[PDB]
Amino acid sequence: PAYRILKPWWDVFTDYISIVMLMIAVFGGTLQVTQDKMICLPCKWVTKDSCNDSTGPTGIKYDLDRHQYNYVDAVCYENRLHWFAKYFPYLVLLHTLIFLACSNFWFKFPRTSSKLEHFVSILLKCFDSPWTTRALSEGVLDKKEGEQAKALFEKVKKFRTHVEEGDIVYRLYMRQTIIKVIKFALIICYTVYYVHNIKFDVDCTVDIESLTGYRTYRCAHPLATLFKILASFYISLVIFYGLICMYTLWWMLRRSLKKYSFESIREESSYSDIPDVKNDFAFMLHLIDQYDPLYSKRFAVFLSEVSENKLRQLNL
Amino acid sequence: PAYRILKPWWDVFTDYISIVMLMIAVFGGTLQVTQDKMICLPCKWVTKDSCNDSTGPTGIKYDLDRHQYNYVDAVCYENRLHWFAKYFPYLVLLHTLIFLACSNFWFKFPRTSSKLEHFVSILLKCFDSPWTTRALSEGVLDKKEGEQAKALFEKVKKFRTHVEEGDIVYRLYMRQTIIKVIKFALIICYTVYYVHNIKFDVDCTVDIESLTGYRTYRCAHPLATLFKILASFYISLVIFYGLICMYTLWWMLRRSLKKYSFESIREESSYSDIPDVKNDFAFMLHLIDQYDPLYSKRFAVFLSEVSENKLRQLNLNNEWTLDKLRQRLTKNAQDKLELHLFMLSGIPDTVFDLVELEVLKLELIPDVTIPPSIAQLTGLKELWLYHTAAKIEAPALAFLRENLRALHIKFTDIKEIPLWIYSLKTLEELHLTGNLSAENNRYIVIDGLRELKRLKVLRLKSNLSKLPQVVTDVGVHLQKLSINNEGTKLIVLNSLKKMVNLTELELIRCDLERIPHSIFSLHNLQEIDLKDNNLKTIEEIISFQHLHRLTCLKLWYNHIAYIPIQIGNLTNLERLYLNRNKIEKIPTQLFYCRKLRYLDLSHNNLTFLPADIGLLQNLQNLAVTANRIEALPPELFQCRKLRALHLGNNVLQSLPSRVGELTNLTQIELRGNRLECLPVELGECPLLKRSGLVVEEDLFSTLPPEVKERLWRADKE
Amino acid sequence: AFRVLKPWWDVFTDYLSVAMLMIGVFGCTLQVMQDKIICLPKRVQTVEMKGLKTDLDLQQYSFINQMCYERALHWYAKYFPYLVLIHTLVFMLCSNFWFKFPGSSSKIEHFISILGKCFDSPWTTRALSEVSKKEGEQAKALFEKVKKFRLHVEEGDILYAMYVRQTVLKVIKFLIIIAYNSALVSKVQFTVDCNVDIQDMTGYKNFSCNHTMAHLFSKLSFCYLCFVSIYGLTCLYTLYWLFYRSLREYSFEYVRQETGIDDIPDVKNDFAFMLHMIDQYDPLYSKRFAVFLSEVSENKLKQLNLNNEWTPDKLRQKLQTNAHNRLELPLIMLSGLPDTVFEITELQSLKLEIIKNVMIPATIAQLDNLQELCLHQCSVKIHSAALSFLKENLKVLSVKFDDMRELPPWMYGLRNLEELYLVGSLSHDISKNVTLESLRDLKSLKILSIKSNVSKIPQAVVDVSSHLQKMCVHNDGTKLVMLNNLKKMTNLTELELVHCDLERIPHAVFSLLSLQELDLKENNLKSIEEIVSFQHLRKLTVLKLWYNSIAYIPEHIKKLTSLERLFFSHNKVEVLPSHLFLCNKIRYLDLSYNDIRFIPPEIGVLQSLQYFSITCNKVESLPDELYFCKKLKTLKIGKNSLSVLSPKIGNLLFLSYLDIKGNHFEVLPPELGDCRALKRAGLVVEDALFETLPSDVREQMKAD
Ligand SMILES: CCCCCCCC/C=C\CCCCCCCC(=O)OC[C@H](COP(=O)(O)OCCN)OC(=O)CCCCCCC/C=C/CCCCCCCC
Incomplete structure (x- = not known):
């Protein structure tokens, strides 16, 4: 759809960070599905619902079947292992899916998508228009290119009247950015506060004494430590994401993007009559300026009426 | 995509090495996830937390369940296994992802990506341009092809102006290479140091005696040796990667890639004026040199301004074809074939393919160079230079020295006047328009007018203050000198008496107010018009009788208040044009001139028209327009040869019916006047047609309809 | 598309590499399996049989398994699939090494591109039909492209050496793989005897193990050995094809036998190797390419296009006349000379302008009517019959x-x-032009005109002086020296030297005893003092010393009276002497655009004068004795300082031309009617002098 021109460096960076968060989520989910188990051994010496931990050594006999061990593992995994260590991959899946939805909502929502495509089409057509090259070079003009330039001019004026009235695109991008930054804050808060509960050694106390004979067990969570690194490294990515989003917010609060100033371009070019655009068109010119100055400089020539008069008298 | 031209061989090699490293990471990750474990067995004999190692052989009874063994395995794998042997594939994966991000950062970062896309697009389009093929072969050019070549040439210029300012791409590539080599060094250091910790046999003393019964165990890590060789293979690839990066770093320190000299191409190609680009232009050109020098060779002929000039000239040849030039062909005042080339970039060779052209007119063409094929224009005699700096060669000079007898030069600057124009051997007619008086250049622009020994006409619109003596020397053969000065008085000082062959001395806007003796000393003068010279009195006609050849005194556009009666002494004039003056009345003395064939008295204060105007039998045109004249006498109508009677905007009461004596009337103007109704005799004049009878319509309708029908039938038949 | 350069061996090796990669991937997937070796200890502690209680846990068994897998199983049985993967990656990388080199790929693409342009060109089957408009132009363009390819690829030999290198690498890799795999395939055994010292951990020291997939790895190793054997046999055949015949040279002698063209040469090096490659692909391509390689075939194509472009009717349109009244064909900037031109036999003169690289065939023997040839700025070649005919x-x-x-x-x-x-130019080393001094073979040469910057007259002219008669030289500012070469002129009659910068008339001209005329054009003759020997030129009637600087005329003119034509126009003469007009045989005397002050009366002696030009002089006085000379046919006195036309002018009966243009006259006399041969055209004057004849004289003059 050639929407790459509407994605500045922050958008591309956040897209790649969200892709790597997708990879975190899939990897952690696969591990939590396949090999997230718990190895629980009963504490032989019990002191008030706690483990006492007291020539040739001899192994301790627990007199438990392998199925009693599996039952103890399942019960202490469900009851006593903290829910973060069990559902971190699903949470990162949900969070990064919401991040992707926030990033691509204005691309998938028809009201903003239609206007985005309309503006992108005429920006790309004006970027390849021969009259733009001639006027930035500024009479020789073929009849057919003159006709197509006049048609593109009338399209530019009609689409300016069609778009300059509304500001839905800028509002949607704003809302997406605030939702992303507040969700960054929430994710960081809860994940940092809950990352310490992913422990290798967990004491479980589930009271299945009638089915096993023991009450307190000591459990090893083999996939805990790895998840910890994953969680920590996932946290790092979110931090970068948030920082990137922070800059985006600052950018969209640095100056009013609903008013675009052609002041530099109309000052440097001969045409000093270029009008100042407003609202959505202003915001998307600002995004395009964040992509490349030359696109905005070239589209500046299709808005002035002195260039229109010059084109009319050349065509005449 | 199309970025293959941008990536050199080292980028492709590093991409392949990164792919193999990612395969290492994936394989090791699957093995770590699925099959990585420890198989720990307790040491029965423990002496100070160490495995003491002290009929038929029988197995050792450890009295441990399978789940206690699993607990021991998990605890020892977690605690007493080195972090490298566990997280080697994940470290490899992270390193490959960082390497791939660094290698492909500039293709994703928008600021550099826009510049790279622009450069690649216009470079590919110039490579595929047919003008590239024409330039390397150096024609048949389709107009789509020609407009593509011109527009994309302008695109190349605009891209150079757009990209020469910044050097972001080079800086980003340098930073990427530096990061890729410093991370290479860190990877080698930490990987080589910790590669010996991937051991098969591992002793673990984890202190789980309260849960197992033993403190020390001897585990065997099955995916260790394999991991070891994987690490070794990984290290090998990293070394290769590092080596490649160093070469790239060396490639960016051997020469300044921000200064790409076009030396080899500009020596090899004919266009030796290709300017040396700078900054990101130079860097991307160096990258495309690393990919394929043919790209840079085909792009080089699209930057040179000599290629600008040649493409512009050949495009000019392709635009203005011979057929539309023949359609545009016209004729000058001398009824000679002329061609008005206005606002052209050059002279097309289609002009020079002609053989019958006589008047080559060149108007406002910037610094054109005339090719020799002008020698084909066999009938070439005139040449018009108006605001045109002309550059010519020697065969052209030969054909102009044997054929060209006219040269019309119009200029506003000294340098617009070329230095070749003084080497013509047949030059005869010559108008210099523009100031010829300057520092070391007052008549020294044109000092080669001694070399031109056949001049006969010299018109000088030059705002002149003095006349050169060399013109007076040339005047042995020169016959016409008309100097236009826009109101500047020359110092004659009787230096014009070598005008023996001069016949038409025309002082236009001279503002003399007096007649020097050199005017009436020159016996061959026949045309004398002291136009706009503000003569209050004309008193020097008496001394003109030594001059036997005067035949036409067109004294027009002057402040002449009165004509003395001595003007009646003349008889020999024919085209006595005394128009645009302040004559109070025409006298009878003026009609003593019997040889008058043409009489113009337009815009005068004549009180009336006397009868003696009819003393002019041979008179053909008569224009007493814008006077105060009421009646035409019958004597005027005895003259049978009146043709052009511009009598309008007058106070004419009526034309007496004796105008029926008139026969040869051709053109008459009567819009104006006071003629109450048309006499039918105005319709009687045969040579007077509808074009000549410029008359009101109502008084024409007063005539009988059948006479109007006869005139109409004479017009249309 | 490089597939046209992939023979059967390359495709076969590529498919074998794919199969070996499949084998390696399958082996690695088999290696993924957790259960690899199964070990039981040795010497463990109708018949009813009882099992031996080894007294070992499952973890002890697993520990024994991994210990014996690491320390008793051979490394080949554990790492064979990875070695297969590495070997097949090396084979795949080194099998495309000839294709994917930077400099080699461009040559390959150029060769296949122009070879496909051949295989689709009409001029190939057209050329076979020749052997057995637009398409001709495309043929010529493709022929230039073929020559460009010859100069572009034939020089180097990178392709052959690179292919040899990759084939040798394939062969040595195959040899190493076969040797070590055949050596170590015996180590893939099912039953293994493991003797690890883990008696302290398990209780036993000797174990008997079974490798579960040892049979599968043995079958995979044998299949890989077979695949590598086929690969190596294919590579050995590639080496045999590379080195059994010299692939650095390709002979087109088969086309020489088939195609009647024998100019087809034998190309070499990369050209040869790629021709062999496409011969392995398709032998028709080289045979069809050969008719485009030869250059005599190019000459035949040029001749065919020359005949096709210019029909004889177009040559009828081109037919015209020249300065010597001959039938001329103006041919301008042509590619060559068509045979259609020689089909015209009524032709009297040929004009070839900048038509270079042109060879004249025997076909010019068709047109016998030639007398003139204009070979202008064109390097022309020749054939024996053309030499004979143009000699004749x-x-x-x-x-x-x-x-x-x-x-x-x-x-x-x-x-x-x-x-x-001989129009053109010359350099400083004039005498080195042996081309000039071969005109000794010319016997009939009579006219020689050399418009060139010639400073020294060559010894060529000295040799050819016996039969040469006319000289016309335009130096154009170049000084002419070494005038002994013009001294040894003997039979010359005409000499026209223009801008030779001869300060004085040399003794060369007086050494000439039969010079009909002399021209010293644009030569700075300040004084004329060597005329004393001019009497030796008894044939001299013409002395056209015009645009000259002769300041005064001395008595030495009496040396020669046979002088008839005398042009001193634009001379520096001030006053004529009494001694010019003694030579009564003078009829043709010119002083045009001079500045003579006045005419002395001794002009009366020149009676046999028929031309007396003194136009644009300062002469104020014409005495009546030139009007007394009635044999004076032409008499030009224009633009002088004279006053009145002579009334007794009708006495001159034979006065054909009286140019008195621009003279200050007053009134023409009525006796112009008595003049029998004077017209308004003849008496050119300003029009106010024309208007003066009496009315009856107008009636007699309009009727002449
Ligand atoms: C970038 C990060 C990549 C990491 C992503 C990991 C993807 C897969 C992770 C989930 C694995 C699911 C299984 C987890 C528990 C293991 C269960 C188990 O032990 O099953 C046994 C079984 C082995 O069987 P044995 O008992 O030896 O059979 C002998 C009788 N034939 O173990 C397994 O292999 C698990 C099967 C799941 C398949 C997942 C992929 C396995 C690895 C495939 C590697 C193939 C690559 C071949 C190409 C290499 C050279 C190019």
Whole structure:
């Protein structure tokens, strides 16, 4: 759809960070599905619902079947292992899916998508228009290119009247950015506060004494430590994401993007009559300026009426 | 995509090495996830937390369940296994992802990506341009092809102006290479140091005696040796990667890639004026040199301004074809074939393919160079230079020295006047328009007018203050000198008496107010018009009788208040044009001139028209327009040869019916006047047609309809 | 598309590499399996049989398994699939190494591109039909492309050496793989005897193990050995094809036998190797390419296009006349000479302008009517029958040598040549032009005109002085020196030297005893003092010393009275002497645009004068004795300082031309009617002098 021109460096960076968060989520989910188990051994010496931990050594006999061990593992995994260590991959899946939805909502929502495509089409057509090259070079003009330039001019004026009235695109991008930054804050808060509960050694106390004979067990969570690194490294990515989003917010609060100033371009070019655009068109010119100055400089020539008069008298 | 031209061989090699490293990471990750474990067995004999190692052989009874063994395995794998042997594939994966991000950062970062896309697009389009093929072969050019070549040439210029300012791409590539080599060094250091910790046999003393019964165990890590060789293979690839990066770093320190000299191409190609680009232009050109020098060779002929000039000239040849030039062909005042080339970039060779052209007119063409094929224009005699700096060669000079007898030069600057124009051997007619008086250049622009020994006409619109003596020397053969000065008085000082062959001395806007003796000393003068010279009195006609050849005194556009009666002494004039003056009345003395064939008295204060105007039998045109004249006498109508009677905007009461004596009337103007109704005799004049009878319509309708029908039938038949 | 350069061996090896990669991937997937070795200890502690209680846990068994897998199983049985993967990656990388090199790929693409342009060109089957408009132009363009390819790829030998290198690498890798795999395939055994010392951990020291997939790995190793054997046999055949015959040279002798063209050469090096490659692909391509390689076939194509472009009717349109009244064909900037031109036999003169690289066939023997040849700035070649015929027939030649080599060396083998027009330029080393001094073979040469910057007259002219008669030289600012070469002129009659910068008339001219005329054009003759020997030129009637600087005329004019034509126009003469007009045989005397003060009366002696030009003089007085000379046919006195036309002018009966233009006259007399041969055109004057004749004289004059 050639929407790459509407994605500045922050958008591309956040897209790649969200892709790597997708990879975190899939990897952690696969591990939590396949090999997230718990190895629980009963504490032989019990002191008030706690483990006492007291020539040739001899192994301790627990007199438990392998199925009693599996039952103890399942019960202490469900009851006593903290829910973060069990559902971190699903949470990162949900969070990064919401991040992707926030990033691509204005691309998938028809009201903003239609206007985005309309503006992108005429920006790309004006970027390849021969009259733009001639006027930035500024009479020789073929009849057919003159006709197509006049048609593109009338399209530019009609689409300016069609778009300059509304500001839905800028509002949607704003809302997406605030939702992303507040969700960054929430994710960081809860994940940092809950990352310490992913422990290798967990004491479980589930009271299945009638089915096993023991009450307190000591459990090893083999996939805990790895998840910890994953969680920590996932946290790092979110931090970068948030920082990137922070800059985006600052950018969209640095100056009013609903008013675009052609002041530099109309000052440097001969045409000093270029009008100042407003609202959505202003915001998307600002995004395009964040992509490349030359696109905005070239589209500046299709808005002035002195260039229109010059084109009319050349065509005449 | 199309970025293959941008990536050199080292980028492709590093991409392949990164792919193999990612395969290492994936394989090791699957093995770590699925099959990585420890198989720990307790040491029965423990002496100070160490495995003491002290009929038929029988197995050792450890009295441990399978789940206690699993607990021991998990605890020892977690605690007493080195972090490298566990997280080697994940470290490899992270390193490959960082390497791939660094290698492909500039293709994703928008600021550099826009510049790279622009450069690649216009470079590919110039490579595929047919003008590239024409330039390397150096024609048949389709107009789509020609407009593509011109527009994309302008695109190349605009891209150079757009990209020469910044050097972001080079800086980003340098930073990427530096990061890729410093991370290479860190990877080698930490990987080589910790590669010996991937051991098969591992002793673990984890202190789980309260849960197992033993403190020390001897585990065997099955995916260790394999991991070891994987690490070794990984290290090998990293070394290769590092080596490649160093070469790239060396490639960016051997020469300044921000200064790409076009030396080899500009020596090899004919266009030796290709300017040396700078900054990101130079860097991307160096990258495309690393990919394929043919790209840079085909792009080089699209930057040179000599290629600008040649493409512009050949495009000019392709635009203005011979057929539309023949359609545009016209004729000058001398009824000679002329061609008005206005606002052209050059002279097309289609002009020079002609053989019958006589008047080559060149108007406002910037610094054109005339090719020799002008020698084909066999009938070439005139040449018009108006605001045109002309550059010519020697065969052209030969054909102009044997054929060209006219040269019309119009200029506003000294340098617009070329230095070749003084080497013509047949030059005869010559108008210099523009100031010829300057520092070391007052008549020294044109000092080669001694070399031109056949001049006969010299018109000088030059705002002149003095006349050169060399013109007076040339005047042995020169016959016409008309100097236009826009109101500047020359110092004659009787230096014009070598005008023996001069016949038409025309002082236009001279503002003399007096007649020097050199005017009436020159016996061959026949045309004398002291136009706009503000003569209050004309008193020097008496001394003109030594001059036997005067035949036409067109004294027009002057402040002449009165004509003395001595003007009646003349008889020999024919085209006595005394128009645009302040004559109070025409006298009878003026009609003593019997040889008058043409009489113009337009815009005068004549009180009336006397009868003696009819003393002019041979008179053909008569224009007493814008006077105060009421009646035409019958004597005027005895003259049978009146043709052009511009009598309008007058106070004419009526034309007496004796105008029926008139026969040869051709053109008459009567819009104006006071003629109450048309006499039918105005319709009687045969040579007077509808074009000549410029008359009101109502008084024409007063005539009988059948006479109007006869005139109409004479017009249309 | 590089598939046209992939023979059967390359495709076969590529498919074998794919199969070996499949084997390696399958082996690695088999290696993924957790259960690899199964070990039981040795010497463990109708018949009812009982099992031996080894007294070991499952973890002890697993520990024994991994210990014996690491320390008893051979490394080949554990790492064979990875070695297969590495070997097949090396094979795949080194099998495309000839294709994917930077400099080699461009040559490959160029060869296949122009070879496909051949295989689709109409001129190939057209050329076979020749052997057995637009398409001709495309043929010529493709032929230039073929020559470009010859100069572009044939020089190097990177392709052959690179292919040899990759084939040798394949062969040595195959040898190493076969040797070590066949050596170590015996180590893939099912039953293994493991003797690890883990008696302290398990209780036993000797174990018997089984490798579960040892049979599968043995079958995979044998299949890989078979695949590598086939690969190596294919590579050995590739080496045999590379080195059994010299692939650095390719002979087109098979086409030489098939195609009637024998100019087809034998290309070498990369050209040869790629021709062998496409011969392995398709042998028709080289046979069809050969008809485009030869250059005599290119000459045949050029001749065919020359005949096709210019029909004889177009040549009828081109037919015209020249300065010597001959039938001329103006051919301008042509690619060559068509045979259709020679089909015209009524032709009397040929004009070839900048038509270079042109060879004259025997076909010019068709047109016998030639007398003139204009070979202008064109390097022309020749054929034996053309030499013979143009020796027999051609007589008039007019060449322009813009370049010294653009003068061809064969003008001088002729003898019948009579006229020569040597227009052009020359350098400082004039005497080194042996082309000039071969005109000793010319016997009939009579006209020589050399418009060139010639400073020294060559010894050529000295040799050819016996039969040469006319000289016309335009130096154009170049000083002419070494005038002994003009001294040894003997039979010369005409001499026209223009801008030779001869300060004085040399003794060369007086050494000439039969000079009909002399021209010293644009030569700075300040004084004329060597006329004393001019009496030796009894044939001299013409002395056209015009645009000259002769300040005064001395008595030495009495030396020669046979002088008839006398042009001193634009001379520096101030006063004529009493001694010019003694030579009564003078009829043709010119002083045009001079500045003579006045005419002395001794002009009365020149009675046999028929032309007396003194136009644009300062002469104020014409005495009546020139009006007394009635034999004076032409008499030009224009633009002088005279006053009145002579009333007794009708006495001159034979006065054909009286140019008195621009003279200050007053009134023409009525006796112009008595003049029998004077017209308004003849008496050119300003029109106010024309208007003066009496009315009856107008009636007699309009009727002459
Ligand atoms: C970038 C990060 C990549 C990491 C992503 C990991 C993807 C897969 C992770 C989930 C694995 C699911 C299984 C987890 C528990 C293991 C269960 C188990 O032990 O099953 C046994 C079984 C082995 O069987 P044995 O008992 O030896 O059979 C002998 C009788 N034939 O173990 C397994 O292999 C698990 C099967 C799941 C398949 C997942 C992929 C396995 C690895 C495939 C590697 C193939 C690559 C071949 C190409 C290499 C050279 C190019």
